[model samples]
Target: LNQRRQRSEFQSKIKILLSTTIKAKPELVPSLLKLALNDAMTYDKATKSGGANGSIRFSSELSRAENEGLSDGLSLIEEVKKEIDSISKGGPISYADIIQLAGQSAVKFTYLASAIRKCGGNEEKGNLLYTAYGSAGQWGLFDRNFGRSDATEADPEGRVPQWGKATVQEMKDKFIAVGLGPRQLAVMSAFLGPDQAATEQLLATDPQVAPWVQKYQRSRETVSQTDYEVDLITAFTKLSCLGQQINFEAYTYPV
Candidate 1:
């Protein structure tokens, strides 16, 4: 029951976060979409570690092969960040907030694009808007709270496997090294979309993780994608708060 309530509150907070972010920064929508699309499309086959710390704004990460051609998104964020800062009167603005905003923007814009495409330029009314929001909700990317702290420095040292090149055992080791246990690692793998070879290797290396993975797979099957979004958001939420001086009271999570 406690877990159920927690999940419920989590979903509510995420929904509020999405709406509030857009309402507060309507002008940033385009930048958010560009960053989100770049991330969603190119995230596969890239290093999975470092979270938002290794985003395009990081000089070291900007030079990576995976980040190539993402300059537009990076520049967009910079411009948006400056605008946000100006609005805040030089108040601290965390990278986590920006990244999450980008994620939300991407989901929203993509949802809009998908809706229009589905409408085939024939309809553009209530159904169109509803379909757009509903479809975007299915992607499950915006199911987390924002306002996480940013890393003060970049980690240029290569972490995680080089996208599609890691053995399952290596991937497992990487996750373990990054402090994730079997269950968390399994959740992350499912959230990130498992690589077939890596999945096989994980099974071979530690069969125990299979049950967790299977559990999530089943959960994904039985639950609405929006509900499942909580799982990924939970995972990301954990990652985002690590090593940060978070003011719990200020956070959107329930007491």
Candidate 2:
């Protein structure tokens, strides 16, 4: 969609809807999504409806815990709705569709920017923080295809990872559980390592001992043949080093 035209207009409407609903029942937004995403199997009343009679299904597999921190993105949807309802001559967007769209957009919007910013690079630093981090294997980059619409049905179960209690090793397990390997992980880190601002923000959530991530922040040397060889090790470990212990702080740059 032309962001200036369709997306901007659509987002405006959603903001209004969110502001109203949140004001009246501030807690409901989080509660609704948490119940729907986390305990759906047990919460019968948590049907997939954004509002009265709306039938859009939310992603069944996104972990409530993992998504708990992503509330800002989801909230943007409600904001869009409020704006739409206030302006349009007819009525608000269907609750079900709007809610679903918001969730989908929030995840993509939040994750994509964070990911890209983390990877924005230059040759001097060569994204060392990404390269030296143990957790680098789980990251990857993709182009933002903005106009794509979300699926109406609930996604298959277990697609999203629960990172709430995750350690570097456990996080790696979760990524591998989703089928990522080491080389792929290294490539991802290389892609995102140069983004200083993003790396700083990521540090707020995750432990610093993650190797490639560490390298991204502190390593000072330029790219070289040696770095490529080391990256190969990073890739192999990410790919095939099941159960192997990793030293997160092993790659500190020399002073």
Instruction: Tell me the spans in candidate 1 whose CA falls farther than 4 Å from its real position.
Output: 1-56, 65-73, 89-92, 100-153, 189-206, 223-227, 247-255
lDDT of 1 at 26: 52
Q: Ten consecutive residues with minimal summed lDDT in candidate 2? A: 139-148
Go through the candidates in order and give each one's C-alpha lDDT.
0.48, 0.36
Candidate 1, residue 29: the lDDT equals 53
Which candidate achieves the best lDDT against the true structure? 1
- Residue 78 error, candidate 2, Å: 2.9
lDDT of 1 by residue, 1-255 (tens): 443455445435444555555656655454444343223222212454345432446776556654444565565556556665544422445665666565554444433443455456444653455453354443343333334556555544455344344455665665566555567566555223224235534554568677766666665444133433445455544554343344332233333
lDDT per residue for candidate 2 within 156-201, as digits (tens), equals 3443335334344554444454355433333233222234345334
Residue 161 local lDDT, model 2: 39
Model 2, runs deviating above 4 Å: 1-63, 69-72, 81-144, 177-210, 219-255
